[PDB]
Nucleic acid binder design. Structure first.
Lengths: 286, 266, 169, 129, 188, 65
RNA sequence: GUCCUAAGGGGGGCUCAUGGAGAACAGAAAUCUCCAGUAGAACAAAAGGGUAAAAGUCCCCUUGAUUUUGAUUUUCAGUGU
RNA sequence: ACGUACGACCAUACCCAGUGGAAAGCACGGCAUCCCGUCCGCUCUGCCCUAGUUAAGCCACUGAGGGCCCGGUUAGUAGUUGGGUCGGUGACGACCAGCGAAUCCCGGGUGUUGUACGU
């Protein structure tokens, strides 16, 4: 029998568009945005962490009725302004991107005429409150050593209050319930990549060249990674809004409009569709 | 209720001294206009957290027979209803239906203006966050009728719709959105529903200067058919239960500020 | 567009199956044979339904299987086709591009016969994919492989003939 | 304006015995020195919540750590009747240990920076003797 | 610009629902110009929001905690209908009526615990449930049996199920009583 | 002493509040300076009587920590 | 008449019944592989819209079998901590 | 206008097939020391962003068959009540209303849009 019939097509119910695209877990999203311990009618912020093949995307997001809003954003390809040109997806680049987003959020808030009702009703016995956000890992796996917790650690070190536990950081031991902060520091400053470089240079030279060809071409020794990442952290904390330009071709917005409309070809109109239908009917008759 | 999750569901659906936050179901008739669908979408966007939504066509006329409405209320545990419908005589109708014990407590009709309606997307402003409770302002002389009428019932429906979750405390940053309903005593009067985001400025004193900016939707209504409650059912619905944390006052017995029970002699 | 290097056929996995149908020492010995044939621990498969004719029970371990990937799968497939002398049938190949066969003895694979284990046959099944099969397997943004990227019976028969130099009857 | 601290920034383990002294560097809060009963002092990078250097060499409990007013030296007084001076930028002991006390060295005090003379710094150590 | 709105009739408030009621008439102009219409409507909304904000900031107590600056609100006073009835006590069961007549006090929570001390084993055991004391000896290796009991025992049945039989009989009687009570309460 | 929690011999003895050996009692521990993990002050805890007060003339207890 | 470190709870991973094409014994019905599969399986209830990266199914942790406090609600207390 | 990350409506977006895609971005990909997890580095996780490649994913367009979504017609009509009514032995035959359909038919369409960062 044939199961994909007219009745099946009529009775079919599609999922959400982003669920069909496999991008959003709405079951987690509903509990992330519509559930709160208290009912104080307060805004809620989430640190959204996403990964591509060649970039890390960190955003600070509020949820509104017509769509989400981005309070601030930071990308791992912006680390080239602070000196990190290679390994833009490793765990330390995740730490640096989280730190950069934290510094940008604090600088935008001014915590590094229009004024708020908090300032209007502030009392004498009041202190500055930290910026609070909750982590959004999406569909990623929350295992020990994952880079979502590196973005979270970098943002928390930058100064965003993110509620978390330390049992998912690298170097944590589940047997003794203790975290090896030596391993954590090594991962923060990229010592795992440096140790891999040294091990490959000891054992497999051609695989070392193939894997770290750009490091050798730019003359980035494994022993300089800790100093480079520390200087990147200092530069990020000094100037969080440093302007960076890429090697991609640069045109204006309307120039890119014209360039993309030159390659977009338009939809057929009713007259053209009717002419094609008449031509098909004539071809079928002939 | 053999299953523990089913037992939890029935205990959630059980009557309580302090009732749960109120759930609204948005549903359509057999024939419903696109403007009415947009209006229900805007109301659902206002009330996402405590609403459910149907997506089929229902052959329901609430002013003829509401047995299907009572069945839907009993099945989905929803007790506010927004019913969309369209007709030649009434082109854009929003039927506000309120339950009590899974039966119809009362009903009201709103007639949407097709010309002056503007959706939330029609305004290029910052929108309300999901789950935020806005404040309410009711203006005009139509809500001060000595006899309960359509405008009093509409005020009750709109207050109950924008009630949200009650709380004893609120953050001062949760005072950024207001919903204003304007209606005048009078051929039929016009009930206007507007939503404004609030911008606050300095004014040189302690209290700040409040400025508003339109957030949407833009809605104009004419009140139509009304189904009034039974007096006994209304009395049973307006009975107020007392919390166990609300103590019963005894004669010559008090509690001091150190928590000691203190008796009075004369 | 058929000369693109990303359309090159390759072995996805090779699955080795032994369905003894009886739990206990026979299933354990079949699992052993799979273990020294593959190099990894096998999987015990339970019977889904109860059939009194076959003498099986629900949730009773009746079968055993191993999934092998990489050049190890190619080596085991080479050994199996050496046993079958590089001759397959048109009936064996599937319409989705996968194929497989079955054998009744395993000592001829090169394993020395051990009297404490005995005689066991097994089913080989080889799955064929092109590069880009991660799209239907990854957790995030999982989608369907396009129609032009699928593998046909004619394509896998041609690949087998040009690669293993075998015959199809 | 200094705002009130309200939450934990970092909980950092590494000492095997109770911590007996702690002091920030005068330059910034990035560097923190702690002396403990495990015969050691330790430098902590407080930005990432990580250890930086572990200063070893005492054989009694390190009762006191004290930064120099310019910030280039760290002095540790211990119960092995000694005082040691360390470079905090490299974690290395400068010269040899200070010997001459008969009992436990309890307190340290650096000379103020504007009073330094003869191209050197002066360090006062108060002991149980 | 001022922060005080003067009206012929004062506003009323319900700060629990953040509701402000304006009994003054909204003099809507009799014009078809939507710009001046919305100017008037926005002015009325501005006045209402300003008076509500002033009321909230002046007549509610303010606490500055780590969560933020919070206004403590009074309970709501606007009457709105309920949607489930105020719960009533259940109809009094046969045991409850008998205990009320006979003065039988409810047991304490310590008295009704599923725990007892076995002296012979010197261990703590459960009175009922999994490995309860009501099934004692159903799994121990040796049970002595009476010759008359084995003679009167039906064929096929063993001594290792007598306690389960008694338990099922008591449980069946318990739901018989419970269903009778439920039916009588449903009739009431 | 705050209250008598469990006399091991009899619930009637517990109700009467008899202080004998092995009795679990509630004690005020404000002077011990115990602070909970959330920052609250724990001023009531459980102790076990380790002596015979009818023989000794005093009550000796050990905290159950 | 046999079986169980009980149920429950939280988190994570996966997708079912069936149909088509393939594989020694294996042959309608044993297991394995692929494709299609709005749930047509399972679990609760008695939808006229229950549930699909789950409320289904397996893993990890708890299993401590009915905690403490209360000047508050209701009932009781000749044994009123 | 195009791409990416979060989204809002949740098929006008779904099911099937074909053609094309500058730029960058996605993506396929390459390697298993460390973190981590599997029968299988298939998935998950870690390192590389070099090299190949637009073959697939993704986007645009086209094409049938379905499905789906809008507006008119059906029609103020069937049907249900008021029983307002004029006569009628009364009923009934007719008007006056209040609610109010659906089938069939005709026409159009096969996604709009928010924030941030880029091309």
């Amino acid at each position: 029998k044939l199961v994909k019939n007219s009745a099946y097509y009529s009775r079919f119910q599609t999922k959400f568009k982003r669920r069909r695209q496999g991008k959003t877990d709405y079951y987690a999203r509903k509990r992330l945005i519509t559930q709160a311990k208290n009912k104080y009618n307060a805004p809620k912020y989430r640190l959204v962490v996403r990964f591509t093949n060649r970039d890390i995307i960190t955003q600070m997001v509020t949820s509104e009725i017509n769509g989400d809003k981005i309070f601030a954003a930071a990308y791992s390809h912006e680390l080239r302004a602070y000196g990190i040109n290679h390994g833009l997806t490793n765990w330390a680049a995740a730490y640096a991107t989280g730190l950069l987003l934290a510094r940008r959020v604090l600088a935008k808030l001014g915590l590094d005429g229009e004024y708020t009702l908090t300032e209007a009703a502030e009392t004498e016995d009041g202190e500055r409150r930290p910026f609070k956000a909750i982590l959004d890992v999406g569909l990623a796996r929350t295992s020990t050593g994952a880079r979502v917790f590196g973005v979270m650690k970098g943002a928390s070190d930058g100064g965003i209050f993110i509620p978390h536990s330390e049992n998912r950081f690298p170097g944590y031991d589940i047997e003794t319930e203790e975290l090896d902060t030596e391993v954590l520091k090594k991962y923060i400053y990229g010592g795992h990549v440096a140790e891999y470089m040294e091990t490959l240079a000891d054992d497999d030279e051609e695989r070392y060249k193939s894997q770290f060809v750009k490091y050798i071409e730019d003359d980035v020794e494994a022993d300089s990674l800790e100093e480079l990442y520390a200087e990147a952290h200092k530069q990020i904390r000094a100037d969080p809004f440093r302007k960076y330009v890429s090697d991609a071709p640069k045109k204006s917005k309307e120039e890119w409009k014209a360039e993309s409309l030159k390659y977009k070809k338009a939809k057929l109109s009713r007259e053209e569709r009717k002419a094609r239908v008449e031509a098909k009917i004539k071809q079928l008759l002939a | 209720p053999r299953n523990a999750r089913s037992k939890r569901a029935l205990e959630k659906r059980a009557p309580k001294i302090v009732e749960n936050p109120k759930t609204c179901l948005f549903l359509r008739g057999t024939t419903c206009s696109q403007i009415t669908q947009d209006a229900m979408n805007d109301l659902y966007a206002m009330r996402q957290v405590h609403a459910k939504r149907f997506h089929k066509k229902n052959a329901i006329h609430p002013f003829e027979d509401a047995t299907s409405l009572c069945f839907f209320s009993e099945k989905n545990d929803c007790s506010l209803m927004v019913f969309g419908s369209s007709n030649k005589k009434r082109p854009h109708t929003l039927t506000f239906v309120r339950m009590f014990d899974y039966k119809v407590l009362d009903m009201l009709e709103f007639y949407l203006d097709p010309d002056t309606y503007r959706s939330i997307s029609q305004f290029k402003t910052s929108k309300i966050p999901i789950g935020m409770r806005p404040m309410m302002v009711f203006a005009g002389t139509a809500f001060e009728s000595p006899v309960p009428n359509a405008f009093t019932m509409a005020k009750s429906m709109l207050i109950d719709f924008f009630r949200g979750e009650p709380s004893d405390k609120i953050d001062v940053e949760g005072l950024r959105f207001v919903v204003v309903v304007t209606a005048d005593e009078p051929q039929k009067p016009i009930l206007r529903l507007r939503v404004y985001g609030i911008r606050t400025k300095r004014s040189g004193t302690r209290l700040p200067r409040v400025e508003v900016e339109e957030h949407g939707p833009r809605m104009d209504f004419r009140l139509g058919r009304m189904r009034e409650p039974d007096p006994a059912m209304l009395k049973e619905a307006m009975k107020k239960a007392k919390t166990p944390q609300e103590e019963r006052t005894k004669k010559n017995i008090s509690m001091d500020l150190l928590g000691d029970k203190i008796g009075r002699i004369h | 567009k058929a000369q693109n290097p990303m359309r090159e056929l390759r072995i996805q996995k090779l699955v080795l199956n032994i369905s003894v149908g009886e739990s206990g020492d026979r299933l354990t010995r079949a699992a052993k044979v799979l273990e020294q044939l593959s190099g990894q621990t096998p999987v015990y498969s339970k019977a889904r339904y109860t059939v009194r004719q076959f003498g099986i029970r629900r949730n009773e371990k009746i079968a055993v299987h191993v999934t092998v990937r990489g050049p190890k799968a190619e080596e085991i497939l080479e050994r199996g086709l050496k046993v079958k002398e590089y001759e397959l049938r048109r009936r064996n190949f599937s319409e989705t591009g996968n194929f497989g066969f079955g054998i009744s003895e395993h000592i001829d694979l090169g394993i020395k016969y051990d009297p404490s284990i005995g005689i066991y046959g097994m089913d080989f099944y080889c799955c064929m994919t092109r590069p880009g099969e991660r799209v239907a397997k990854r957790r995030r943004c999982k989608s369907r492989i396009g129609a032009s990227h699928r593998i046909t019976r004619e394509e896998t028969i041609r690949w087998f003939k040009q690669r293993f130099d075998g015959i199809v009857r | 304006k200094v705002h009130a601290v309200s939450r934990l920034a970092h909980r950092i383990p590494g000492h095997g015995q109770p911590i007996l002294s702690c002091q920030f560097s005068p330059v910034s809060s990035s560097r923190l020195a702690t002396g403990s009963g495990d015969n050691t002092a330790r430098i902590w990078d407080t930005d990432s919540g990580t250890p930086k250097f572990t200063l070893k060499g005492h054989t009694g409990w390190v009762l006191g750590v004290s930064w120099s007013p310019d910030g280039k030296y760290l002095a540790t007084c211990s119960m092995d009747t000694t005082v040691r001076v360390w470079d905090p930028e490299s974690g290395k002991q400068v010269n040899q240990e200070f010997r001459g006390h008969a009992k436990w060295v309890l307190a340290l005090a650096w000379q103020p920076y504007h009073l330094w003379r003869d191209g050197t710094a002066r360090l006062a150590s108060a002991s149980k003797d | 610009l001022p922060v005080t709105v003067e009206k012929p009739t004062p506003y009323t408030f319900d700060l629990g629902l953040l509701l402000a009621n304006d009994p003054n008439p909204v003099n809507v102009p009799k014009t078809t110009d939507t710009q001046v219409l919305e100017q008037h409507l926005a002015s009325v909304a501005r006045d209402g929001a300003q008076v509500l904000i002033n009321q909230l900031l002046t007549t509610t107590t303010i606490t500055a905690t780590k969560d933020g600056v919070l206004l403590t609100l009074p309970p709501p006073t606007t009457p709105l209908p309920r949607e489930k009835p105020v719960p009533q006590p259940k109809p009094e069961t046969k045991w409850q009526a008998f205990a009320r007549r006979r003065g039988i006090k409810p047991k304490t929570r310590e008295q009704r615990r599923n725990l007892q001390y076995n002296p012979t084993t010197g261990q703590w055991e459960r009175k009922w449930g999994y490995k309860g004391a009501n099934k004692r000896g159903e799994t121990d290796p040796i049970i002595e049996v009476s010759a008359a009991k084995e003679a009167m025992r039906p064929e096929g049945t063993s001594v290792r199920g007598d306690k389960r039989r008694e338990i099922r009989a008591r449980v069946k009687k318990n739901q018989k009583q419970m269903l009778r009570n439920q039916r009588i309460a449903a009739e009431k | 002493i705050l209250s008598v929690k469990k006399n091991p011999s009899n619930p009637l003895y517990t109700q009467l509040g008899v202080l004998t050996k092995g009795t679990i009692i509630e004690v005020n521990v404000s002077d011990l300076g115990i602070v909970t993990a959330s920052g609250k002050i724990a001023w009531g805890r459980y102790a076990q009587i380790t002596n015979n007060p009818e023989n000794d003339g005093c009550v000796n207890a050990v905290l159950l920590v």
